Point group: C3
Chain length 277, copies 3
Amino acid sequence: AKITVGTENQAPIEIYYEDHGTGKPVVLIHGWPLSGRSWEYQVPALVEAGYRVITYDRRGFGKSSQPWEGYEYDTFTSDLHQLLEQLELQNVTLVGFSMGGGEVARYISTYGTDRIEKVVFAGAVPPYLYKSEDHPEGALDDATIETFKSGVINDRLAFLDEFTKGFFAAGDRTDLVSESFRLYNWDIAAGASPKGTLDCITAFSKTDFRKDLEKFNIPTLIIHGDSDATVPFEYSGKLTHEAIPNSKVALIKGGPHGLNATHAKEFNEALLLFLKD
Amino acid sequence: AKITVGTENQAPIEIYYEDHGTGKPVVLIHGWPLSGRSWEYQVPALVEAGYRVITYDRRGFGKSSQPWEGYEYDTFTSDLHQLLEQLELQNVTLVGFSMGGGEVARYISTYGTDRIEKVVFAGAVPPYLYKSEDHPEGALDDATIETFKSGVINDRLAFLDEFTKGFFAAGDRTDLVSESFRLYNWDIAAGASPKGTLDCITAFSKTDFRKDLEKFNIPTLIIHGDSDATVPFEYSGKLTHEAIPNSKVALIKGGPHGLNATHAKEFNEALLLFLKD
Amino acid sequence: SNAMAKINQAPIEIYYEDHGTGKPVVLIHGWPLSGRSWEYQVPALVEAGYRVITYDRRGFGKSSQPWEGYEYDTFTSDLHQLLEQLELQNVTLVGFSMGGGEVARYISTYGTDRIEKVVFAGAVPPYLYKSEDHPEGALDDATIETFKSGVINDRLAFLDEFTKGFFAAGDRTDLVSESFRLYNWDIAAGASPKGTLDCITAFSKTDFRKDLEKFNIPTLIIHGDSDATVPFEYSGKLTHEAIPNSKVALIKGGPHGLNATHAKEFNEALLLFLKD
Ligand SMILES: [Cl-]
Ligand SMILES: [Cl-]
Ligand SMILES: [Cl-]
Ligand code: NA
Ligand code: NA
């Protein structure tokens, strides 16, 4: 229940995954800096609705290897390719949460749709989060990005504590998950690679997926919160929907970034409607 | 230190175990939703007394694989059998704590007594924990059972926080462990399979071991607290003792469910006096 | 990346991580933590052009948790197997707290052919035990027994308290966040209870004074002036005095865990010594 996806200095880089149930495959791709365990509220709904659910832990996160390099989307996407190939998956639905939307974007662009029936962008970073002189439309400027980087560099554990509180907060509303659930998530992020945790920030904030979204001509759903403080709908999900013909949008009212946990009922109803269609 | 005990969706199921010391083998089987680490206070006393001590993590728990299926006693007992077979254990004592009493009961019933010297039911779920009009001497009625399942389904992490508090409390006394120790146990439970955690509730509450206990013709010890909130003596150990006429009881005054930790000396004394010839 | 080094029936494996390319710097963590304790050193070392290897001592972090071998003969044998398996050359061994014991015993037992330099950081040599005959130690019998009975009786609570002192410099108890402290508590909580206990005797009562007589290579002592567990005066000071040509970096306000609280100074001292 590890996939070997490469080597670094001749040591295998191994990806931890879980593969549950019977049915068409739904591959769930977690956000930063969490793991496959962040999909707790989705897995049973999906299996009960007749799908086979695969989660995996991105390199550097969860129970996967912690290499020094490879923390960019070409490699992240190759890692996903090895998983789909090794499990011999067909008619797959790719569900990318937050930075996992990047693997989705790039997978279609690089490897095409032979194996892929449908895709879902859930609170996801495309089309391109960076705000700059060349891309004045985006959400995250250098200054904002540097704060994340400097937090991870100077006190990652305290920064993660703060980040996880905000991840499940919608505006003023900070009671959408229990303190135990928050701490649980903090601890999943605590164990991650410090290097991978840092490099991911650059990857998810500054990778431009616009060219990739062009190759999308399969059914596509955007699930997103209207109160997402990390990846604002107007700068991400809304534009991914507008980039992709025939895509559907489920804007969840009062949904924060971690809306798959906070608004599980609504998230799953939108996801399940989309899959059975 | 893993044993492969099966396969599901093309991937092995592995059980983590530890094997310490030299002498007669004593296999310690943990309760829900913890791991082999719950035996911290027993292992050293057993090793020092000249026993070889094997702990393992039940499928779905601790460091073992987290599959989707197999969370019922036929499989759990099959996993135990493979552990005994693979480690070639002879002249074994099985010690089952809480739901681990179920593997004890079912092993003897299914595989016989040829490998087995003695057995111990510690705060253990047999004979049959379900409580109903027709089976009034169970411990857990439908409503209670549904409160467990609901808690795990809707906020497992908060539910576990509360469960761990009651686990070590003897009536109104809740200072029997430190907060650090309780939180340690919380974290062990947090990392378990959500599905395994849920299905176990049905396994331990609705499995009838009465027929299995009929086959116990080997020396049997019941160790149980008189203040066990989760598995009360009167509706479990007391009845196991009555079901197995040879059996000895060590009823520990002020003992909560987690009495192997709160009353380690009294627990260990009962175990050592029984283990000896 | 990470890998396992093979070192009843099941092999003992040591978990290690190997990052970057260049001359190797092998970081040996203190009790009862793991390789993850080096968080603040790894990046600066690789950025400076070194390869950084960390490993988890048997019983700790992600390594096997056997019943025996929790003494410096075996701990140093484990280190030797790792360096042999990786075929390392020109190594700088960095031993934090009890990890200075592996450094001392490695040079004494296996010699220096694979080793260019050594660093004793907040380290337990020359001999941490404090007694009548050996007043120059740090830890007396009453203190040692407090550690043992704490670990036997409520290891989790003992660790919570230990981790508070680890990062405190006298009255400065704000040097790390609660989050960081609790992260370190959890790393310790998952270690072997048996290894955790036996290490106390290994780090407190092993005498490395004859080992330090074999040191004829460049040597840096990095130590805090406010280390409650391993006071400079009874450790790093004496290790420096034992070793000719050895350098000292005494960090002002540094507690035991100064590699985290004072990363900037710890790292400056280390890099200056590595390139010389
Ligand atoms: Cl993300
Ligand atoms: Cl149980
Ligand atoms: Cl130490
Ligand atoms: Na953990
Ligand atoms: Na027998």
